[PDB]
Design a protein around this nucleic acid. Structure first.
Ligand SMILES: [Cl-]
Ligand SMILES: [Cl-]
Ligand SMILES: [Cl-]
Ligand SMILES: [Mg+2]
Ligand SMILES: [Mg+2]
Ligand SMILES: [Mg+2]
Ligand SMILES: [Mg+2]
Ligand SMILES: [Mg+2]
Ligand SMILES: [Mg+2]
Ligand SMILES: [Mg+2]
Ligand SMILES: [Mg+2]
Ligand SMILES: [Mg+2]
Ligand SMILES: [Mg+2]
Ligand SMILES: [Mg+2]
Ligand SMILES: [Mg+2]
Ligand SMILES: [Mg+2]
Ligand code: NA
Ligand code: NA
Ligand code: NA
Ligand code: NA
Ligand code: NA
Ligand code: NA
Ligand code: NA
Ligand code: NA
Ligand code: NA
Ligand code: NA
Ligand code: NA
Ligand code: NA
Ligand code: NA
Ligand code: NA
Ligand code: NA
Ligand code: NA
Ligand code: NA
Ligand code: NA
Ligand code: NA
Ligand code: NA
Lengths: 145, 119, 115, 246
RNA sequence: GCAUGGCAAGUCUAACCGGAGUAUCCGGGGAGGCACAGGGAAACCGACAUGGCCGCAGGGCUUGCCCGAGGGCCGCCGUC
RNA sequence: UAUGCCAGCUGGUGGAUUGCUCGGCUCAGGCGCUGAUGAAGGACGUGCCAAGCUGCGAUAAGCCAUGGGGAGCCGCACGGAGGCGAAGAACCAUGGAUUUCCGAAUGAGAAUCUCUAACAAUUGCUUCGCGCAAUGAGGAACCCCGAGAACUGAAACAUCUCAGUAUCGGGAGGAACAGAAAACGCAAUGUGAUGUCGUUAGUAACCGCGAGUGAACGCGAUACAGCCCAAACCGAAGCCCUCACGGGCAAUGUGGUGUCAGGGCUACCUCUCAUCAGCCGACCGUCUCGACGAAGUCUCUUGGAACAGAGCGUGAUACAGGGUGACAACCCCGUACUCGAGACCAGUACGACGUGCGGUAGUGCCAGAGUAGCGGGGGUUGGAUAUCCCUCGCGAAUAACGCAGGCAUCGACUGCGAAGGCUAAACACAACCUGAGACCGAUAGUGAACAAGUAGUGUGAACGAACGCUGCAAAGUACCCUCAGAAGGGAGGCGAAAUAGAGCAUGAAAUCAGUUGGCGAUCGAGCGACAGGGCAUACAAGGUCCCUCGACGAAUGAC
């Protein structure tokens, strides 16, 4: 049995005094009315802040952490093996609608890895070289200067 | 129309010529064999035998056939009025069986015999 | 108010074992299992690899998911496994239904609870 | 497991391996959910007239004549819910969504599971079906699909000692209630499901309470009508092989 | 929010298309959405698959003593 | 025990209840215009007897043809009389005839009638004559173009919101509208007419930056389709009317060419399969309608009736639904199967006829002005500087030019040619056809299952109900008595039932008559709950209960 089901007979249906569930006054105003007066409580403060840059001047980077690449190197049997060598672009999903691919250095790198992407973070590099590996910057990556 | 309301509606409102089918009856064994049909639209000439009513068992000549009310009058199948007069007790051709045919009509008999049309 | 007739039997069986046998893990799991689905365990390999040890059956009073790496050769016992998990697991160990664990070890001994 | 194939005479004729699916654990709860969904999905939207009861300029005289403040016209109350001829407070609505969503995985699982329940002589006996056989589902040669006369499927069914189930569904129930008035006066027990492979048995379909299906699209309903698992089924040599990949 | 159920680092398809037993139903359709990294107005940069301590359940042992997921207290890391 | 209280019994009143469904409600597929050739609508007529409804129109519930249909028929509507049908009626389909008056209403006037040949009025062509034509009004909503609130929200209220909503004016079609970039601007080596659907996104943008408001590109789909002028260069090679003669239009340019794969011109190359004009002209599918269509009406019992129970038997590519004196696959309609017709798709697709596409070089020959653009003031929008529009003023270039890419200017880059024109299909609605339903089931569902937009109300705009059910069959009550009596009553008849007898299935409560039990003319008022007594009670569905004694005997506990 549901709560609604049990209301027949209660008269008030759980609203207390029958003088309650009337109009919007029982709500302190229609919609967000009073967000600054009576019900200012729990409403982010009023005003403007900052600015935005035109939507089409904005570049969206497709990112991935070493840990993800590394945790599945073996499993990526359909990807070069050497002295492994993986081009990130082919790994990351959404790597099409993205203005470029960027490797981030979160986690561990337990294999010697040869990584090819458009951009890397310090941590990703250090980590990938520290495991006897190399990071190769794509031709698009040739945008550092 | 699988819906009861429409089914009944179409029966009760069928134009005159579409009522003929409502006054059909089953044909004795001999007759089905002779013409190749299971039933026929009863005519005021045919002889028939009552198979269900209180008059079940009785046989008689078809005196009248109403298409509006989808009913027939069979000789001697009557009711005793108060004044002593005897009037016909309407019957449903569904509780009747034709034992004899009146074939004075080339057309009816033409239809009866053919194997592509039914009478 | 559990809907699954299977999960419902498993719990019943877990109880039957905990009581008869000397187990305490089984009754413990029985209870967690009776608790809200949201409270049940969802553990990836990455965790199991971190706290399990050979010859000590891992018991997950929930489901096991295949995120991360498992190298240790351990026996994991869960309500269920993502196909990925049960795959990665049988590659270095053995994935086992709790119903089978209850049978190969009704005293619930040398077992580790992971969540 | 093993599957005993039958020729059109009812005599053993080899045997095939009962595909894995018939080994899926029977989950009547998921089955039921899929049958429920199927049935709701074919229900039609309805609703009373948006303006029903609102077609008038009736108004309230207010206080002053010892009458309750009710809108009136020509001295007859109108529009309000508590007034005869008034609007229906909260009526059925066209707008309402009477459909049910079900995860493909969740649904396909229910089909295999319904499938599996078909292979259990006990379940099928519990569901209510009448038959004196031990193996189930009944698998038959592909020549079944060429039958053309109903009467022939009958002999084949009497030979397989499964005909008693059609005897069961050869009784109609004139329901209780007004469904009657809306063309639902009758209802009958569901008997045997014939699942072929190329087309649905035109020879079996008219059988008392029998339902015909095809291996590629047979669903959770024909497999477990009313959400009840364990329907007495008869596949075709080929059907049985197609089913397996579902 | 919650109870239940499916799948799980993923998950769900929308319109729509084919099939059919033709509104049901079987198959296809992942466009796209939310989740998988955050910080910053922006430029821009970009994290602990566990380093320490308590310790509930549970387990272990030679019956207080170990191991202690979850939990708790810190460290450390990304960014302004 | 008057008046009377409480409960019940018999009869009534009343019409709930249950059952029933000729109506509603909603969804879906199909289809979709009518009208000066006088529509829709209204008025008045039209029948043997005819008030209402329906049809019809002085040829008046109808006339003619062809097909279908069939032995019956003369509407709803079952009376009386009479008639029609084998000279093939009824009925159904298509086509034709007739078709009063008012009505856009059109000779003029008028509350449906009148006065003395009429496209009235406004237009096009024009033989300048109403000679030939057009318009006008209607329609369920849908569509396009204009005019445009307030309650309300903001807890007041002005900008904002309700909302370009309600409502008003003008008008199209079966669909409208839009539409082959002076586009987009995931900026690109990219996309490639338009609607619509999904998403993008409650994102960007607006906003007393409050409340609120709110796209697009792109993407996935549906359906797909691309062309014609103006001009240059030609210069009457042209068009319309008429059978013809003949007349009219046209140098203020009919016609050819041509239209950003720019074109024209000159010299060349090659070729046509583009396009445009006209001819032919469907399949399939889908909607509807129709033909044909298997198998019991066997036995016994109950019953008014078998469609019930028991027994015996049958069909099924047909066990959808309905009817029939009760629960019917096999009694009848139908249903599956097969087949036929009409409509839409569509004057479309396909096919064919004619035309001729395209390329190179040269050439500043051509290419839409109160425009592009700026300014003043408004409106509108998400459009912010960067929406779309109105109005007042100002105002350019000529492809070697010009516009756009979300502020202005200059340059570059990329895109693209405004100020001429057309355009199939996919999308909206639901008047019309058909089908469907976990919708309602007669105080519900439409206001309307009934005489329903009826009766009735209002000067008018307008407002606006209630009413379903005899029976298997009318067998709808003969005859007799009574009575002022076709009333009513009595007796009697029919039927299973008249307590089914006419607003007639069932027949609740309030309530009324008569009557039974209890109480009762010395007595006090929430009408009772729980105890305990009197009186009353057919069975059934409850069967217990009373007294002696005795056993057991908590707390309590004596004389
Ligand atoms: Cl920004
Ligand atoms: Cl985890
Ligand atoms: Cl683009
Ligand atoms: Mg994508
Ligand atoms: Mg014949
Ligand atoms: Mg109503
Ligand atoms: Mg009922
Ligand atoms: Mg006039
Ligand atoms: Mg306000
Ligand atoms: Mg305010
Ligand atoms: Mg707005
Ligand atoms: Mg855009
Ligand atoms: Mg031309
Ligand atoms: Mg505005
Ligand atoms: Mg009503
Ligand atoms: Mg009565
Ligand atoms: Na409450
Ligand atoms: Na209240
Ligand atoms: Na408020
Ligand atoms: Na009204
Ligand atoms: Na009163
Ligand atoms: Na809906
Ligand atoms: Na996707
Ligand atoms: Na139409
Ligand atoms: Na009349
Ligand atoms: Na006429
Ligand atoms: Na005219
Ligand atoms: Na003239
Ligand atoms: Na307010
Ligand atoms: Na005020
Ligand atoms: Na504002
Ligand atoms: Na894209
Ligand atoms: Na009958
Ligand atoms: Na201006
Ligand atoms: Na642009
Ligand atoms: Na009524």
């Amino acid at each position: 049995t549901s709560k609604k089901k049990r209301q027949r007979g209660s008269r008030t249906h759980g609203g207390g005094s029958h003088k309650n569930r009337r109009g919007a006054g029982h709500r302190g105003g229609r919609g967000d009315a009073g967000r600054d007066k009576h019900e200012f409580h729990n409403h982010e403060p009023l005003g403007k802040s900052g600015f935005k840059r035109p939507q089409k001047v904005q570049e969206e980077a497709a990112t991935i952490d070493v840990r993800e690449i590394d945790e599945n190197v073996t499993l990526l049997a359909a990807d070069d093996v050497a002295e492994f060598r993986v081009d990130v672009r082919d790994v990351v999903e959404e790597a099409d609608d993205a203005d470029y691919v960027k490797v981030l250095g979160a986690g561990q790198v337990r294999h010697e890895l040869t990584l090819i992407a458009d951009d890397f973070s310090e941590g990703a590099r250090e980590k990938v070289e520290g495991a006897g590996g190399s990071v190769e910057l794509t031709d698009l990556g040739e945008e550092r200067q | 129309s699988k819906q009861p309301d429409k089914q009944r509606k179409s029966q009760r409102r069928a134009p005159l010529h579409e009522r003929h089918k409502q006054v059909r009856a089953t044909l004795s064994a001999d007759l089905r064999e002779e013409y190749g049909q299971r039933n026929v639209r009863v005519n005021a000439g045919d002889t028939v035998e009552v198979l269900r009513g209180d008059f079940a068992g009785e046989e008689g000549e078809v005196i009248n056939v109403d298409l509006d009310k989808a009913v027939i009058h069979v000789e001697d199948v009557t009711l005793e009025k108060t004044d002593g007069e005897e009037v016909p007790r309407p019957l449903d051709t569904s509780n009747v069986r034709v034992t004899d045919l009146d074939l004075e009509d080339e057309k009816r008999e033409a239809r009866l015999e053919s194997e592509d049309d039914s009478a | 108010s559990k809907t699954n007739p299977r999960l419902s039997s498993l719990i019943a069986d877990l109880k039957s074992a905990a009581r008869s046998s000397g187990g305490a893990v089984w009754g413990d799991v029985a209870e967690r299992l009776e608790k809200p689905r949201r409270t049940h365990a969802e553990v990836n390999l990455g965790r199991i690899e971190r706290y399990a040890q050979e010859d000590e059956t891992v018991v997950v009073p929930g489901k096991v998911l295949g995120s991360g790496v498992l190298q240790k050769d351990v026996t994991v016992a869960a309500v269920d496994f993502s196909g990925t998990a049960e795959t990665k697991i049988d590659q270095v160990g053995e994935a086992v239904s709790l119903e089978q664990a209850i049978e190969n070890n009704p005293e619930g001994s040398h077992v580790r609870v992971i969540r | 497991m093993q599957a005993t194939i039958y020729d059109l005479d009812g005599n053993t004729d080899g045997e095939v391996d009962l595909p894995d699916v018939f080994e899926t654990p029977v989950r009547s709860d998921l089955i039921g959910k899929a049958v429920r969904a199927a049935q709701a999905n074919r229900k039609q939207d309805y609703g009373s007239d948006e303006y029903a009861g609102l077609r008038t300029p009736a108004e309230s005289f207010g206080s002053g004549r010892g009458q309750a403040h009710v809108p009136k016209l020509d001295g007859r109350a109108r529009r309000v819910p508590q007034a005869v001829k008034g609007r229906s407070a909260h009526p059925p609505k066209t707008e309402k969504d009477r459909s049910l969503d079900l995860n493909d995985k969740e649904r396909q699982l229910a089909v295999r599971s319904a499938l599996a329940a078909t292979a259990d002589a006990d379940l099928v006996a519990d569901r209510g079906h009448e038959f004196d056989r031990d193996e189930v589902p009944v698998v038959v040669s592909d020549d079944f699909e060429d039958l053309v006369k109903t009467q022939e499927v009958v002999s084949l069914l009497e030979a397989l000692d499964v005909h008693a189930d059609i005897d069961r569904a050869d009784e109609t129930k004139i329901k209780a209630g007004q469904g009657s008035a809306r063309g639902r006066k009758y209802r009958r027990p569901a008997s045997i499901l014939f699942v072929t492979s190329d087309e649905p048995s035109t020879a079996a379909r008219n059988l008392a309470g029998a339902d015909v299906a095809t291996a590629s699209e047979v669903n959770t309903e024909d497999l477990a009508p009313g959400g009840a698992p364990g329907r007495l089924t008869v596949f075709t040599e080929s059907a049985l092989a197609e089913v397996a990949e579902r």
